[PDB]
Design a protein around this ligand. Sequence first.
Ligand SMILES: CC(=O)O[C@H]1C[C@@]2(C)[C@@H](C[C@@H](O)[C@H]3[C@@]4(C)CC[C@@H](O)[C@@H](C)[C@@H]4CC[C@@]32C)/C1=C(\CCC=C(C)C)C(=O)O
Ligand SMILES: Nc1nc2c(ncn2[C@@H]2O[C@H](COP(=O)(O)OP(=O)(O)O)[C@@H](O)[C@H]2O)c(=O)[nH]1
Lengths: 62, 122, 85, 671
Amino acid sequence: VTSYIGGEGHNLQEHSVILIRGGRVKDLPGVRYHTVRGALDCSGVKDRKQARSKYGVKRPKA
Amino acid sequence: MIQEQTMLNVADNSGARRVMCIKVLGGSHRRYAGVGDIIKITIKEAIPRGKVKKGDVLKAVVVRTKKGVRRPDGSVIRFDGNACVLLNNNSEQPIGTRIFGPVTRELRSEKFMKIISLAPEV
Amino acid sequence: NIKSAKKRAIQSEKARKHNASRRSMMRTFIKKVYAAIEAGDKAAAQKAFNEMQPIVDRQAAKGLIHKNKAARHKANLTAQINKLA
Amino acid sequence: ARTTPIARYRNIGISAHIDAGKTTTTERILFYTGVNAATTAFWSGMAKQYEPHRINIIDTPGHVDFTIEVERSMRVLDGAVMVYCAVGGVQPQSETVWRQANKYKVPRIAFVNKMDRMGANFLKVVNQIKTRLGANPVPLQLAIGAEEHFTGVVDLVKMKAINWNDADQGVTFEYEDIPADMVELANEWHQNLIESAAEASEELMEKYLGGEELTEAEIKGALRQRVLNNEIILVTCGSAFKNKGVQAMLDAVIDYLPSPVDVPAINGILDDGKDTPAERHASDDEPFSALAFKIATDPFVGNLTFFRVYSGVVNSGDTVLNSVKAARERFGRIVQMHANKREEIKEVRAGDIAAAIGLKDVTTGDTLCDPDAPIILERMEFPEPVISIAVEPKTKADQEKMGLALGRLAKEDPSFRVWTDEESNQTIIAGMGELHLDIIVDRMKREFNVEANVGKPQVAYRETIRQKVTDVEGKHAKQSGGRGQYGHVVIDMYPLEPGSNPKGYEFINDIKGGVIPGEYIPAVDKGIQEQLKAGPLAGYPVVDMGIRLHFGSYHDVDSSELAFKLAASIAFKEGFKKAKPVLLEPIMKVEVETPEENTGDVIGDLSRRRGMLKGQESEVTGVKIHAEVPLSEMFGYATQLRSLTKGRASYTMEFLKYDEAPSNVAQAVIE
RNA sequence: CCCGCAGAAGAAGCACCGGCUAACUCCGUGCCAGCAGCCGCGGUAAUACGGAGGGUGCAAGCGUUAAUCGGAAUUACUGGGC
RNA sequence: AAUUGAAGAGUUUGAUCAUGGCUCAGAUUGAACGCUGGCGGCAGGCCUAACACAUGCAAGUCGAACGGUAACAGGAAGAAGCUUGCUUCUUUGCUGACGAGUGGCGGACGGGUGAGUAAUGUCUGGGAAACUGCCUGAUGGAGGGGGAUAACUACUGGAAACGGUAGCUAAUACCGCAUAACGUCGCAAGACCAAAGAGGGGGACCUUCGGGCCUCUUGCCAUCGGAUGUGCCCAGAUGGGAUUAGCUAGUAGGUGGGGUAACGGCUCACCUAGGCGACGAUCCCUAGCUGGUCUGAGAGGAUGACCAGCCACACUGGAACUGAGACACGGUCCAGACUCCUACGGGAGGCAGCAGUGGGGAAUAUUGCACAAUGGGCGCAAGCCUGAUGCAGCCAUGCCGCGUG
Ligand SMILES: CC(=O)O[C@H]1C[C@@]2(C)[C@@H](C[C@@H](O)[C@H]3[C@@]4(C)CC[C@@H](O)[C@@H](C)[C@@H]4CC[C@@]32C)/C1=C(\CCC=C(C)C)C(=O)O
Ligand SMILES: Nc1nc2c(ncn2[C@@H]2O[C@H](COP(=O)(O)OP(=O)(O)O)[C@@H](O)[C@H]2O)c(=O)[nH]1
């Protein structure tokens, strides 16, 4: 299946092992799932600060 | 006396069931293989699971020939049918892991020890 | 199998061989009676019935055949030994 | 609970060049110690002479390829028995393990094996340790004859010609005295053994100057004091095969190789904060601290994690801390490989080694410390691969599994690496050499049943033009049926020089007063931009191109972003065709580091490899050679660079630039 | 479980703030990067994107996903239509 | 006092309403993932592969059934180094006790799993032809004989698993004989059926001085009851499919034999030619059922983890033997797939018991402590066994408390 990769930027290439989420993209007919950032071989969104729980970004060092 | 063509039964798992000799290895113009010689083989039957599949090309060890075997003294051992143990193409050495039906003393080779260790007889 | 109460196996074997042999002859006696009926010999039927009655009863007691079976044999054997004989 | 011997611990690893017996010799021990790859066993000393000492042995690989197996196998443990072939001198991979011992300043003795072999020569090799390894040997022994006439050895401390007998392999003795043959040689010791022992302390030699024959007890302490301070390498010699020699060498271990306390306490850091040597004295009653060397997976107990406990203690159930991952682990079952049996343990003290079953995420190099007393430890170093090769999963099905397996082999071997080429997405593995790579792939077949064949990695080529091409013309004019649409553009395409990092592309708005409105001018740029993603020669990005607007035309309405975007597209073609296009290839800044002896061959090969040379230093002992050599041409360098320099030659490379590819190359690179 | 000891000492995150929906501004961005359960935001003054300040809701959990019923009288016996 | 509770919102239009669907607020979860994470109480924790399994444990127990001595201990049908009432050696099973063996009872409980089973089961309500260990009420019996055999001893084969010959021995093991009704067959007259001893103590009388003998406590046999358990029968309910319409030879009934604890085509021979199905037979697909769980105002819809009842299964197919009970989860036999041991001739094993590994997966835990308690097996008891159970360890998985002033 074809699946969305949300957030600004990603690693993710031909052999990346990912975790697929479920949830459509109503601009992309046929794309009915998201790829869960920060899970397995997908990195979180670099430099993001808000809503970090989505996009798999860890708290930046209190 | 095995020779090119000639179906052989198989005396191991691996899963061959029926197999055909496509060459008697070991010499130019060598006519027959028997006793405990090696032959090139093409699988004709093959169980569904199995290490091997139909159409494969391997080697194998003649383990029972109907023409049987003699050795010293003058006696004979004859088996009702022709059977062999499939060998991996590079290393000789059974691809199987269990042997079925009796095998003979002649097979007492370094490489064929694993066969007589298995195998319930002679 | 590694549970030493596998003596039960060697034990209940002695049992099977014992049971077998006793259970064997009480059958061959019941047979003798049916044979007589087939032969037609009223005498040997009631004779052979007398010989088999103690066997059937004793074994039922010893717990090899059980009670109601014992009954059923001498029951309908009787029925027949004096149905034409 | 209680413990037992402690501080009678000998953490030694055997390592040497290939053959040599560095394994055969190790099995021989387990025989001798076991009267009546890590293992442990107990040596009471061959004569009964000793209070039983507990020895942790590690037989390491020879070879390179798996040098990682020595970094770890020398970082952690305390002593080292460097084996040498009675026939084969020092030889290249002896030097490398030498450097690894020095890297970690690990004390060491020496064992010249194979004295029974033709061409055996004890003292020759001893001398090579001096000459080739720039170290200070001290023959702690002398060989009774050589090759097939190798009958025994001379303990030249206790000054007796040790005799091992016929059967029972070793054991037995009768400690015979020196034979008439060697009395002359025997009356040396290298008197600078005793003069080497002397140099421990001057007050120890002051009586030596004063001709006072030193007590046997004070010498052993003397040179041991200096073995420990690695200023001296005792040599022992023997022949594992004849069983004539291995045993005397064990004694030399307890005699002259450290305890875990004869040792500098560990260095390290605190967490966030800063340094302080972690210190942690080699003491049972210190806070626990250990380093994880070597990860494996046994099919019945799961993950095995070998560690060396430097301080404190761990009990089965104590939840230690992986400081270098910021997560805690809970110890469970523990196993010591015990000569030949995975013996179980509930407690593991400092100065010992063992493998922890079941630990979840502990890679090689991590520190397991006390959660209240957190510290990072030194962590050895990761050899850095020298070879790469691309692999594909033979069966397209297996492609998923090939992924899984290569991953596993990575966390087991840090000297091995895997990734996916950002361009021409093929799976690329990398290792310390041809053989390394071989048995990795072989290990996939055996353990993960993924067979895959291998090939030369692909190369990212580029495209450019060579001639400035004068005013080329693009035009659209779409009277078809719908949107009017018409754009006309005239431009100059010209090569650049490698300029401004990010661009490699230059668009210039040298448009007239207003032949095309500046609102459409962004578009014409976008149109060219599109054509650069994979140019007309053979796909592959276009680079180092500049473009100048000069002339065009529009309708007052029909023209549009799209219209000029196509016009530009068309303008790019035809202009490119006439511009003398060429295929670029990538070059590396290449740095070869080689001995003096063969800088001739190495230079010539760099040249053979279609390479340009640029400098030489003569940096100390080797000679750094500097060169620009193309990528599609460096493949498998390691393998041959080795052949040309007897194994002794690092090298390094990274990207530098793109230059024209020679024609036969270019026309070959046709997809 | 009770009795003593020292000192605030060792202990706060997570989603949201265009409508549905409790919670609004500046900056960056310029149909790009992106958001998005539904409608829909983005082509130079974006409370919708991303950062900040501020706020709102929950709190040792908070979100997202997956799942069953509900709202769905949208299979209508209760309780629908042509 | 105790099933007393029913909410709407967004989305097609210039605007409207309806239509319809899509969508949202709630409750719930054996959850997972991302970011985050202090404690406690109670509970929950392989939903996928009924996939394959290393290791240890999960079933024994009685010397008050018997012969008995391998080890322990004591005493000694008595003895040194002298450490003369304090030791460590040899004897003697004397006593305590106890390896192996016979014997008895248990191993059919306890625990696991959901593969199979759409009705061979489960549920509800009835029914008649049945057996039922230990526990219990009543009535009497418990006499007198015989042949064996493990262990053992002597030869002897194996690497191991296992044994092989010959001879010897005990009992509550085994078989006759007697005894024989309120038992069984039989209208009756009549025929016929069983069993076991063992311990503690003891006045006399006494004997081969073993004990007879006396007493108390148990156990043995028979019959009829009680209790509990189990087997069998009927009706109704308990999924979807007609893009499955026909189905049926032991088939439906009968008669007579046989058979079971028992009724019965259960089986067999013969005679009848029936029996089932549009109220869905047949054949396909899917599935353990229930108490209950979740949701809902209700009717409904969804569901069958954890607790309790019922059923089924025990590596796969099959079979019986022992027994009150099995066609037996840690029993036997055959066969198959597979794994393991071997000195190559030959052997062995089945975690869906607890813990645990690999594998699969988005995902599910310790190779823990203890029989102290409740309960189960054996035992007169003391006690031994008990991964049932009682606790702890792991995980924010849930619930409820409390803190971080
Ligand atoms: C046992 C030991 O100590 O080293 C052995 C074991 C060894 C270090 C091996 C070399 C190399 O595979 C090593 C790697 C990193 C190879 C890549 C992966 O498979 C690793 C999981 C593996 C770990 C150990 C291993 C398998 C050895 C050799 C091999 C020599 C080979 C030749 C042709 C001379 C050695 O020591 O000479
Ligand atoms: N003849 C002889 N051979 C030896 C001796 N020591 C080692 N070897 C041989 O060295 C070879 C490899 O031994 P091993 O220790 O396994 O090598 P390593 O593992 O590389 O150290 C074998 O053939 C051994 O017999 C020796 O003392 N005499």
